[PDB]
Structures are given as C-alpha cells and as structure tokens.
Amino acid sequence: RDLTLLQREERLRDLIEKQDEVLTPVVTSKDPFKDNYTTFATALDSTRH
Amino acid sequence: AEINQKSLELELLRLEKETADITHPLYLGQKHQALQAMNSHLEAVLREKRSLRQR
Amino acid sequence: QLLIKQIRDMRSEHVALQNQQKLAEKVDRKISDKDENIQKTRCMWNTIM
Description:
Radius of gyration of chain B: 23 Å
Protein name (chain C): HAUS augmin like complex subunit 6 L homeolog
Shape of chain B: rod-shaped
Strand content of chain B: under 5%
Structural class of chain B: mainly alpha
Number of helices of chain C: 2
Helix content of chain C: over 70%
Helix content of chain B: over 70%
Organism (chain B): Xenopus laevis (African clawed frog)
Largest sheet of chain C: none
Strand content of chain C: under 5%
Protein name (chain B): HAUS augmin like complex subunit 2 L homeolog
Number of helices of chain B: 3
Structural class of chain C: mainly alpha
Oligomer: part of a larger assembly
Keywords (chain B): Coiled coil
Organism (chain C): Xenopus laevis (African clawed frog)
Distance between the termini of chain C: 65 Å
Number of strands of chain C: 0
Order of helices and strands of chain C: HH
Largest sheet of chain B: none
Shape of chain C: elongated
Radius of gyration of chain C: 21 Å
C-alpha cells in the first residue's frame, strides 16, 4: 500500500511542476493585456456605425 | 486480505479524482483549444496593424 | 504442510518488498508542499480561462 501511493504522488508532482513553469509568465502579463485589448476593441467598434 | 485490496483501490481512485482538473488529458485538452483560438486571433490583429491604425 | 508452504512463500515476498521501499525513501523528503502546489496551479488556470 505505501509503495503504491508513493508512486502515484510522484507522478502527480512531476505533472504539476511542468505546468507551473509555463503558466507563471502568462498570469503575470494578463491584466495589462486585457485592459489594452478592451480599450482597443471599443475604439475600433465606434468607427463601424 | 480482501478488504485490504479493496481499500487500496478506493484510496487510489480518490486520489485520481481530486487531481483530475489539472492532470487528466481531457481537461487539459480543453484548455489547449481555448488558448489556440486566441492565438490565431492575435496573429490576425498584428498582421492588419496598419489598416487598423488608419481607421 | 499447507501452512509451511504458505509461510515460506510469504517470507520470500516480504524480502522482495523491503528492497523496493529502501530505493523509494531516498527521494521523499520534500513532500510538505503538495496541496499548496495543486491549488496554485488550479488558481493559475482559473485566472487564464
């Protein structure tokens, strides 16, 4: 039982570590993008009517 | 002995359920798709920067 | 005779499993940070999606 549970936890850790490495840069640049994009889209939308 | 085997199985299944959103291929696949759609859109916007600026 | 056979078989199995546990403990100190890493990863995804 102990060996089997340890093997599964190790696999889970490996998977989480690989994801953290790639998600951290995207979350940090999110808020400036969303705000710049929304302002841009609203400005563009006012020229079509 | 039989109780012990089934108890282990239960414990394993419980661990898998609790971590499925971040680990299972199904859920990870859905996140990929959403990200690819946005990429393509941004590529397009960057390609038409001049026209959009003029407008 | 049956009991003799069963005990011998189990002893052999116990030694084999002991060798496997000694190889797995050389990797585990760092586990005190799992639930925290999972929630961190989940939170990053929720923010992006």
